[PDB]
């Protein structure tokens, strides 16, 4: 016991060498890291026009979970599922029968930007989900206005990768429903009522709301002290 003394190190200026602290704040990151962080910052600093600022307000966790719950019951055919349907149809036509009979009409999610745009323009889409992170943004920046003019309920959802895995792709810009089964019409109606309150009913007043204009943490510190001085 008397041989285990306490030898406190002194880390003041001019004293013992500084210990290994966590210096992640001071790291010299590679150039691509710095570029992608400053891209996000610069989009926050400037004034964002309302057309782009629309995409900043996405469905909350709960409503998005409900949307993807409904929307997962209508996923497209995988390669294997289509393969089996095709062999079944081949059997039917090697008999006297045809393909239309043995396979029911499909009721699936609709994806693909050109396809979904043309579905909206024909008033065939009942619900459109738009990814918030599409780049270049002009691919979907007009979509809320189009859906408004066509009276098609829409929601800016989070995740082109989520929409992608819904339809067995890496990413998907949009996802749409043209129809659902009789058992699901109630939940689709409730979903549409919930999202219409934030998106299609607010579209005209969001047309007037600019985004961005947000300063950094140190600049917000300077403003706060100026606000307390006059206080």
């Amino acid at each position: 016991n008397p041989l285990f003394e306490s030898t406190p190190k002194n880390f003041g200026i001019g004293q013992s060498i500084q210990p290994k602290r966590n210096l992640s704040r001071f790291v010299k990151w590679p150039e691509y890291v710095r570029l992608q962080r400053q891209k996000k910052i610069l989009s926050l600093r400037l004034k964002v026009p309302p057309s782009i600022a629309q995409f900043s307000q996405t469905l909350d966790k709960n409503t998005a979970a409900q949307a993807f719950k409904l929307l997962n019951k209508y996923r497209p055919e995988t390669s294997a599922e289509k393969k089996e349907r095709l062999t079944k149809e081949a059997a039917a036509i090697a008999e006297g029968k045809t393909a239309k009979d043995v396979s029911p009409k499909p009721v699936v999610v609709k994806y693909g930007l050109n396809h979904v745009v043309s579905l909206i323009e024909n008033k065939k889409a009942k619900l459109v989900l738009i990814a918030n992170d599409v780049d270049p943004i002009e691919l979907v920046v007009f979509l809320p206005a189009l859906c408004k003019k066509m009276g098609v309920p829409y929601a800016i959802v989070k995740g082109k990768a989520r929409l992608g895995t819904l339809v067995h792709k890496k990413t998907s810009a949009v996802a749409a429903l043209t129809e659902v089964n009789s058992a699901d019409e109630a939940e689709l109606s409730k979903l549409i009522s919930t999202i219409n309150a934030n998106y299609i009913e607010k579209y005209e007043e969001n047309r007037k709301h600019w985004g961005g204009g947000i300063m950094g943490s140190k600049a917000n510190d300077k403003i706060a002290k100026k606000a307390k001085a006059a206080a």
């Binding site: 003041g12 200026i13 001019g14 060498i17 500084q18």
Partner: protein
């Protein structure tokens, strides 16, 4: 005509500085945490001659704050600094000859050398033998200090800029005449190729604007516009006045 000697100097071929025997550049320490917030102690190891320079240099050793390692710095030696002396650099450093302090921490009238124009540039002003910078006044609200330079000019510098207390050593070189072309030869042998100098009026017209004529004479005014072009700027460039200076300035 021909490219004049003025113009040839900028290509830097035979006119680059002769630097083999030089002893490293003389700079202050980098502004680090210790100098911003407290002070750091170093010890003078050597006072050495730097060829091409009139002022001696001081080799001063410091501990590295962040790793087990010794850091050597090359300072311009002020008069009275000796080998073995402890040197203190930082915001909290005492007002002693050889110490490095922010200009805001020095009272009015303090003599200081190797002063920074901008904070952290490691020294720009008052570096030659016998010269120094005087602190004239402080403007704490603006965090500015007013100083007097060797040329007589007055300047405003940030109070966070540093200087070294005292007068640069080696002062008084110019009080003794060189006496000889050979002494001038040995002087520039370790500086650059600027000596001897042929007079422009002793050349031919190809060589210089002053060349030629059946007597040696300039032939037009030697005062040249600031807006003149290269090949024309020989003589007294943009002179406000000429002739013997009489009276105060």
């Amino acid at each position: 005509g021909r490219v004049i000697r003025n113009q040839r100097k900028g290509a830097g071929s035979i006119f680059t500085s002769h630097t083999r025997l030089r002893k490293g550049a003389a700079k202050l320490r980098t502004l680090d945490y210790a100098e911003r917030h407290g002070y750091i102690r170093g010890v003078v190891k050597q006072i050495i001659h730097d060829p091409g320079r009139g002022a001696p240099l001081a080799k001063v050793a410091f501990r590295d704050p962040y790793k087990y390692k010794l850091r050597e710095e090359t300072f311009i030696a002020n008069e009275g600094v000796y080998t073995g002396q402890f040197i203190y650099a930082g915001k909290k450093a005492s007002l002693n000859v050889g110490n490095i302090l922010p200009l805001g921490a020095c009272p009015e009238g303090t003599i200081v050398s190797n002063v920074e124009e901008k904070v952290g540039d490691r020294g720009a002003l008052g570096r030659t033998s016998g010269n120094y910078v005087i602190i004239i006044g402080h403007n704490p609200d603006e965090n500015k200090t007013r100083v007097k330079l060797p040329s007589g000019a007055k300047k405003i510098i940030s109070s966070d800029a540093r200087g070294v207390i005292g007068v640069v050593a080696g002062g008084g070189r110019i009080d003794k005449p060189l006496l000889k072309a050979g002494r001038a030869f040995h002087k520039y042998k370790v500086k650059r190729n600027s000596w001897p100098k042929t007079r422009g009026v002793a050349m031919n017209p190809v060589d210089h604007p002053h060349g030629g004529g059946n007597h040696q004479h300039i032939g037009k005014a030697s005062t040249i516009s600031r807006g003149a072009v290269s090949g024309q700027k020989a003589g007294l460039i943009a002179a406000r006045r000429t002739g013997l200076l009489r009276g105060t300035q």
